[PDB]
Ligand binder design. Structure first.
Ligand code: 20Y
Ligand code: CA
Ligand code: NA
Ligand code: ZN
Length: 368
């Protein structure tokens, strides 16, 4: 039936600025929050302010040297760390900005706090839209991500769960998460993503894991222009087969909104309803679920997406007419919650979708 939802948000998040022209806008988390508050969704869920995750918490995955660097680097001392910046991939796509470490701490704190709450059986779902930074690696920033809150939250879940399922609907391959768990069967990682000379360049369907983790990494490579129909063709069948074969006891769902139609960086054509169908599918399995944010560069659509997916988590129907809010002008000219797909060509034929699905089903037969 209906579930208990705990939601994590820190009002300071929207103030972190990656710099002039950088497409990552933490302000989108505040727009999301303000919109869902204006729909009255706070009446149906517990709202918590995450703690600032410490260096002890972050070094459960990341190296001491990389976390020490992130704690130290500032725009004022940048000149003195030119060598370290190159070593850790900080300074270009992953810039040094005021309060960078605090931004890492808040984004991470919500995911780890959500995992603790699920481990304690105090909630059915935990939501952290400021999380989902799937590209960060053990000792390296990547793709605007510095600290991998997802890996840390999964490590927290593994204290009480033998098997954790990770599902990733961001347009990009969930490389940092897949890499962290590549050689274990205790986490199965399932990523659906644009593939073919696209960032980060990994996630071929032939990448299936290694050693004990062989068959525990699943990749569904897609072409430009995927629509609700095509995505819906394959998501429920793959997740259903994964649930059947893997039998996880907890799930982490990365809800990156860069897979929506009209994304500034992305090349997919999903609506908010098509993207949210993924949350509905996963929610149906009735397992402890951690829902996380991710990419998303057309900020008005990110706020619509995560507001609607919070409503889905709550089994709460909300009107398409947007309520007034602090960012009302961002939603023009329509001022509606739902979006239309564009006329872009879907390069993913129905045969291609079915064929990749069949190849993944062959791999899933290899589980015990
Ligand atoms: C050349 C090129 O295309 N570069 C590039 C573009 C987009 C992304 C991205 O979408 N990154 C991301 C960031 C986050 C972050 C969330 C919060 C802070 S960063 C979460 C998920 C993804 N996929 C990464 C790299
Ligand atoms: Ca993905
Ligand atoms: Na794995
Ligand atoms: Zn992305």
């Amino acid at each position: 039936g209906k579930k208990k939802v705990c939601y994590y948000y820190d009002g300071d998040i929207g103030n972190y600025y990656y710099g002039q022209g950088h497409p990552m806008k933490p302000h989108r988390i505040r727009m999301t929050h303000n919109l869902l508050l204006n729909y009255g969704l706070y009446r149906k869920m517990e709202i918590y302010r995450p703690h600032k995750a410490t260096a002890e918490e972050m070094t459960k995955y990341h190296s001491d040297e990389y976390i020490k660097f992130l704690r130290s680097i500032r725009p004022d001392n940048m000149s003195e760390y030119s060598k370290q910046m190159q070593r850790f991939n900080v300074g270009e796509d992953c810039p040094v900005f005021d309060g960078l470490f605090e931004f890492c701490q808040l984004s991470t704190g919500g995911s780890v706090a959500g995992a603790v709450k699920l481990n304690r059986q105090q909630t059915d779902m935990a939501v952290n839209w400021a999380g989902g930074l799937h590209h960060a690696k053990k000792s390296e920033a990547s793709g605007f991500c510095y600290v991998n809150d997802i890996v840390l939250a999964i490590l927290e879940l593994l204290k009480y769960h033998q098997r954790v399922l990770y599902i990733d609907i961001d347009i990009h391959h969930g490389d940092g998460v897949e890499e962290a768990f590549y050689t274990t069967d205790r986490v199965m990682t399932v990523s659906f993503h644009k593939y073919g000379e696209y960032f980060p360049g990994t996630g071929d369907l032939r990448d299936i894991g290694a050693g004990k983790g062989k068959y525990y990494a699943v990749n569904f490579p897609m072409r430009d222009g995927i629509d609700d129909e095509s995505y819906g063709q394959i998501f429920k069948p793959i997740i259903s087969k994964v649930m059947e074969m893997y039998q996880p006891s907890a799930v982490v769902l990365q809800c990156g909104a860069d897979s929506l139609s009209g994304d500034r960086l992305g090349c997919f054509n999903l609506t908010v309803k098509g993207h949210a169908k993924c949350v509905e599918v996963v929610k149906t399995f009735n397992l402890p679920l951690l829902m996380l944010g991710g990419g998303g560069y057309t900020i008005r659509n990110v706020a619509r997406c995560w507001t609607y997916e919070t409503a889905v988590a709550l089994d709460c129907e909300i009107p398409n007419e947007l309520p007034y809010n602090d960012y009302f002008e961002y939603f023009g000219p329509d001022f509606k919650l739902h979006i239309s797909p564009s006329n872009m060509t879907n390069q993913n034929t129905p045969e291609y979708m079915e064929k990749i699905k069949q190849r993944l089903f062959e791999n899933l037969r290899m589980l015990p």
